[PDB]
Amino acid sequence: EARLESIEEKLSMILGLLRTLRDGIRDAMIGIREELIADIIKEAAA
Amino acid sequence: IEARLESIEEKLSMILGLLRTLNIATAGPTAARDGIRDAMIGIREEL
Amino acid sequence: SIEARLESIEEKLSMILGLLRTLNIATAGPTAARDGIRDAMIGIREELIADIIKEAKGKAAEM
Amino acid sequence: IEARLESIEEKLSMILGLLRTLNIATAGPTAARDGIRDAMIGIREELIADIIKEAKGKAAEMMEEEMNQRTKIGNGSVKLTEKAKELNKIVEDES
Amino acid sequence: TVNVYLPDSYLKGVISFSETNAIGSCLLKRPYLKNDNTAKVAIENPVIEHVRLKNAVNSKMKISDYKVVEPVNMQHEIMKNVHSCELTLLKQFLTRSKNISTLKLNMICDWLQLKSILSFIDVEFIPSWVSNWFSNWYNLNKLILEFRREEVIRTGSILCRSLGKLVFIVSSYGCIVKSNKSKRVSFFTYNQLLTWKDVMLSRFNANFCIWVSNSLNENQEGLGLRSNLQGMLTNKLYETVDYMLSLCCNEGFSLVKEFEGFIMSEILRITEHAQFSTRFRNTLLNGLTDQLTKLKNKNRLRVHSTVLENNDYPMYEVVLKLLGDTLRCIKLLINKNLENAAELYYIFRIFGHPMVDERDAMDAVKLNNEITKILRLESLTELRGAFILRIIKGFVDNNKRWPKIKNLKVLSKRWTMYFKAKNYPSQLELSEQDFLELAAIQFEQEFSVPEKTNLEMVLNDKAISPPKRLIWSVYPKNYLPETIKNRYLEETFNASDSLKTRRVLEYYLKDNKFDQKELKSYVVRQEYLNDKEHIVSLTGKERELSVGRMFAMQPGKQRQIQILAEKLLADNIVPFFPETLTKYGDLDLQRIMYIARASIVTDLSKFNQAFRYETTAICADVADELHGTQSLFCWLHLIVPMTTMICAYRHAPPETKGEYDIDKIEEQSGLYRYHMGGIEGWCQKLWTMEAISLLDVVSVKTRCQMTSLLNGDNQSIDVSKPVKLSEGLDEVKADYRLAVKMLKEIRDAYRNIGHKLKEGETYISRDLQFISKVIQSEGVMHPTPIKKVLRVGPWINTILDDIKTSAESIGSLCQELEFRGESIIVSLILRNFWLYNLYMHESKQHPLAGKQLFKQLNKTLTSVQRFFEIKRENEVVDLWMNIPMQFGGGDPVVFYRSFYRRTPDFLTEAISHVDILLKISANIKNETKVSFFKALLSIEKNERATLTTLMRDPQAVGSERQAKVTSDINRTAVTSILSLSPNQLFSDSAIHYSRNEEEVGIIAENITPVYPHGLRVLYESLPFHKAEKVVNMISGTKSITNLLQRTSAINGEDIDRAVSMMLENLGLLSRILSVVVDSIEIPIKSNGRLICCQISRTLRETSWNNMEIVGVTSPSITTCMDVIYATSSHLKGIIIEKFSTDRTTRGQRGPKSPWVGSSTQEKKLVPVYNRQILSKQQREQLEAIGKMRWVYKGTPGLRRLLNKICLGSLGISYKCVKPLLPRFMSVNFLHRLSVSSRPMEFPASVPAYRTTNYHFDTSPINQALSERFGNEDINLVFQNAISCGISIMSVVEQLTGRSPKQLVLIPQLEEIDIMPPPVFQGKFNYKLVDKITSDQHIFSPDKID
Ligand SMILES: COc1cc(C(=O)NNC(=O)c2cc(C(C)(C)N)cc(-c3ccc(F)cc3)n2)ccc1OC1CC1
């Protein structure tokens, strides 16, 4: 009943941003850098 | 019963992630269209 | 059908995930490439990652 | 509990409808032949109206014939035009 | 010191609209054919060549006394002009060809046991619809050859000659024709002078072939070709179309284009039910009449403000009547006969070629490559899902696993369990939602980009564009302003020698700072996205019969990227798509051949210009993910829209306002910038894959079974579906309904992606009938015999006019009348006609050699006479022209080639041919015919036995008994040129080449016995091999000593070398007959005949100092086998029997499957490991090392040599690659070894359908062989014996009207020997390889980490 609460909350956000079809650049930057370091770790010894 | 719920939550998380980038190319203004270029040119030297 | 009422949810939201993937690929084109934002839209692909490591280690070795 | 499942089902169904009916207009010249206009997304009719109001001259025509009009064929059987019947009468006769 | 400009003899090029306009505008001082910028520049600042042409013309009669017309208004008068008659010459040629042909016919009938047919060709009554074309061609060709001879002496020459009532003034840069009868003048190019000649030649060849076939078939049916064409009606067709094209100036070729469609409609009427045929015919007629209506305005718009504006155009009615008459002529030639319709496919050439406008096709495609396209997201994602599903299936089938998936959380439970189980659903599953939810998957890197640049990939003999700033170098200086010229001279001083070349070879060999690791960094860093110096040029070179087809061209840097992307797709991803890769050779020709069945044949010719980034990226992204790159498979739509389209042809300039930068010049008829579509051929594989994957979605949406074949530019979709609806309209209406419904579905599917299929390019049918452009109906194939023999004549397919290559080409082209057509006599007659013309009439005058050649020929002709004591000089040429070329005679077809296609041991075949030729020749004494072989065996074998010759050519002979070739004589010159180049890598490789060549032969010198095919394998296992390819690619360039100079002319050294080779190969027969040793024993047989296999083996052994070769000698089926005719009664031979009872067998099919002679080689125990990461070159290395390990076992030094090779090539030890190597389990590699130089198929010399109606029994011959030999292997090839038997069945029916019911081939056991597996003794010289691998490392593969 807890994961569903987050689920119902996020559907409203998803529809809100989908109806438009400032801050997203920073989100994209942090997102790419999130997996860039992990991929580098895997690529870099065994 | 429980794997399905967490899988649904993860898939919605990726849905939100995708929906964030979709409004930089066409839905986003051309003025801020060049903002990410500085960071991208900086990634080669940020690591 | 309690366990079947949320597996259809999963399939449907995976379908919209595929739709959004295709939409994201489509909109990052010649306009995005010239402004140097296409790679942030698609991401890094294990090949530019090796390139940066080699120069980073090469410079570190040159020390 | 159960009701929220139905609510999320409705939300997903309508999101699927919206994403199924969505259309894309490709990137191209800005109608001033100076720069490239980026791709657009929206409903088919509004995109067509905007693009046609943008188009000038012969280009517009082919667009009208390439996205609005289409080949209307039923049970095949293409009819030969009146001018093409004269070729037929000169070719298939006196042989 | 001496540079020559030998012109062309055949078209081999393109007719230019702008060059003609420039010539005419310079001569008239008014626009000609058009009022574009070309006319302006030509009027104001004409080029020096056109000024000289103008002066030459003015010195002669004045131009204002005649009506100026286009060169195409003159064909009717040019094709009807009569000069001196040439009937006696034609009679002489025909008589001599008949003599040579009767000698060969005696040869065949002697051993086929047969017992005046050439008398059916009556030379005194030639129709005169064959003679006129011969006379026209003779006169025009004489003029052209005289001009070529004159031009070789002086750089720029103008020659004037009178041909009847026409006067020609010919030059290398322009031509004029004036007609006194009509009082009119025309201006054209050197092309349009030797295309009219080609039209005359083709008309003569076609009419001659049909006349000969009709003469043969009127006395014995089945002796000639299986098609009955009237020749008078073909002459009428030629004249009518000539007149129609003359009236309709140059827009009439778009009207000639529809003859193929008309023939297709006739075939469909013959073979199908009215519903399909009427639809096709009506669709054709509507478009044809639309074009007919639109013709007049096009011409009247083009010729505005021109000298031709005052000429009158034909009205609608006259052109309509002309079309009616020509279509009547075509329809009457097809007398409801499907063989005539397939026969008439040769008329697409017989009328001439159109004059292509460089700046008009570009304009026509501009607006197609510019419009915005509205796309549906759902279909766009379904296509991506189908592509991903194809990839998944390919990996699951080949590797038994899924590709690596970045995130295993975008999958539902169904696809999650499918992932865990490592399989995929069946076609009955996979609804649309499956594609939608599959399109969410992202792959990880499964492949790789090679770090080193593949020198065999980039290096080619092609052209490249200049950079953006150095683009004014493609136009004459006179055509440009002064400021442009000054700034261009300033700019060309700052450029390097590599950024000044328009050729790839000079682009690389002249590079001073080349690096093999540069391309990897270039691709990974995406240093092509924002390139100011990027440009796409469109030189406008095209192909046949089209008003526009632009050949695109690029600078070298991005050319590398295009080549690399195409190669990576071909190597890694084109597999998984059997529909496309298997198109040519297996899929369509033989493999593919109530439940309703139908076919759709949509075209994909103009497929690239409707593609956009949004339609290509959805799959190029999957390719990038698999290969790990960022943007390498979608470069085109990322870079092309940012640059300028130029159309940089030599003459047509742009109208610049005096500014250097092309990106600043306003868009014109030849310039535009925002090109949103695709370029033709640059990303063809990806677009093909998308087209294939769209049909998967279409098939899933409906529930039909679709199979797709991609034969060229056509897509053939064969559709099946259980109709489950009957009791009304039974069978034909069901097929029609299925076809219509699926046509609607396919057109809708293509529309949703952005392609608007035209009504005139897609059609429906009941069964596929034009796959790869071959007409096959009901299992019988109807050939187009006279389509490859239209241009047979003197000096064909020769860079420099050398008789050897020209004779080989004549023979090769005429052998098709035997392979495809079912007539051997027609092919013999044509071949000997043209060979006699070449040798005895055209060798007296050579542009570069003079009379020398003929003198040489006349000496060889004397010697043979003196050797054979021939009384009459006329019958010594007959004998000489039936001797193989390998011994120094003129005969570019060996005997066996008429019965089976492939063989080992060419030498034994040549020996057998000469033996039978001397056997039938009841003109020489018996002593001399046995003395010829003693002369052949008299050798001076004491010479250097280098084993690299056998590595290059396992079937090579030594001691100068062989004929020399171009590669072996140009090798030293090419290496010497490469040694002096700025590129350090190439210079070092060329410096070490000689030593590496001398050392590669020493590795296995002390190994016995010598197995030349094992030596070939060892050769392939070394990097030297690859270098030896590059040299051979540069040897064939027509100018070796001018590679590093910008001359585009043939140097004197090259001419001297070529002439020396040509003159030295013409005396080989004289050389071998000079010395005879009388102490040589010929192995005569107990039949009174000589054993050809033993003589061949002795000759091969002696020429190599008696070094006991093994595995190369094998008997010829023509001499080790005796053919007789019975009914299940004879002594232990192979029996060939006929299924049916009918007399003849042409045009029928039988119950049996087609006979293809396969080898069933190398029973192989392949390993089980991942091979996806390895490039193709590394896989070939592993295969070569495996073959080396298999062939040589227990030989001392083998393991050390293998370790050296593995370390040199792959960089890792031999014991670390042992698991990766394949394991062969077989004892006889003399039989099972598969390697180049060793044929892997043994087909018969008849079409496939003809082999389906015979069957063979080999039990008695097996019993006889087991009685004589043991159970071990022998020399005789079995596939080849069966092939020869089938071809005998066919040829006997050809020569005699009755096909034998059964024939038996008895083996003669004195010609057959055994090949037990050999045991090798001696130690390998394994050290040398090290050095080689060090100095040829630029051609090595990438080292395995
Ligand atoms: C593919 O390259 C080759 C293949 C062969 C080949 O196939 N050798 N043949 C037999 O070993 C064989 C054995 C037997 C036995 C087992 C005794 N019954 C019978 C027959 C046989 C033949 C014709 C017939 F009409 C009937 C039976 N042949 C030979 C040489 C080849 O290339 C190298 C010379 C360069």
Numbering used by the authors:
A (entry chain E): 173 to 193, 204 to 226, 230 to 231
B (entry chain D): 172 to 218
C (entry chain C): 171 to 233
D (entry chain B): 172 to 266
E (entry chain A): 8 to 122, 129 to 606, 626 to 1377
In the authors' words:
The polymerase is a multifunctional enzyme that is responsible for transcribing the viral negative sense RNA genome to generate polyadenylated mRNAs with a 5′ methylguanosine cap and replicating it to generate new viral genomes. The L protein contains three enzymatic domains: an RNA-dependent RNA polymerase (RdRp), a polyribonucleotidyltransferase (PRNTase), which is involved in cap addition, and a methyltransferase (MTase) that methylates the cap. Here we report a conserved allosteric inhibitory site identified on the L polymerase proteins of RSV and HMPV that can be targeted by a dual-specificity, non-nucleoside inhibitor, termed MRK-1. Functional analyses indicate that MRK-1 inhibits conformational changes necessary for the polymerase to engage in RNA synthesis initiation and to transition into an elongation mode.
To compare the binding of MRK-1 to HMPV L with that of RSV L, full-length HMPV L-P complexes were purified and the structure of the MRK-1 liganded HMPV L-P structure was solved at a resolution of 2.74 Å. The structure of MRK-1-bound HMPV “L” chain Cα backbone superposes over that of the apo enzyme with a r.m.s.d. of 1.1 Å for 1204 atoms, indicating that the structures are similar. The inhibitor binds in the groove present on the PRNTase domain next to the catalytic His1263 residue, equivalent to the RSV binding site, mimicking the same binding pose. In addition, the HMPV polymerase structure undergoes similar local structural rearrangements upon complexation with the ligand, namely re-orientation of the HMPV L His1263, Arg1264, and Phe1310 side chains that correspond to RSV L His1338, Arg1339, and Phe1385. Hence the MRK-1-liganded RSV and HMPV structures are highly similar with each other, explaining why MRK-1 has antiviral activities against both viruses. The RSV Cys1388 side chain sulfur mediates favorable interactions with the fluorophenyl (closest distance to phenyl 4.05 Å) of MRK-1. The contact is missing in HMPV with substitution to Ala. Instead, an empty space is present between the alanine and the inhibitor (closest distance to phenyl 4.82 Å), which could be filled with a water molecule that would be in an unfavorable hydrophobic environment. Thus, the cryo-EM structures of the MRK-1 liganded RSV and HMPV polymerases provide insight into how the compound has broad spectrum inhibition of RSV and HMPV, while also suggesting why it has lower potency against HMPV.
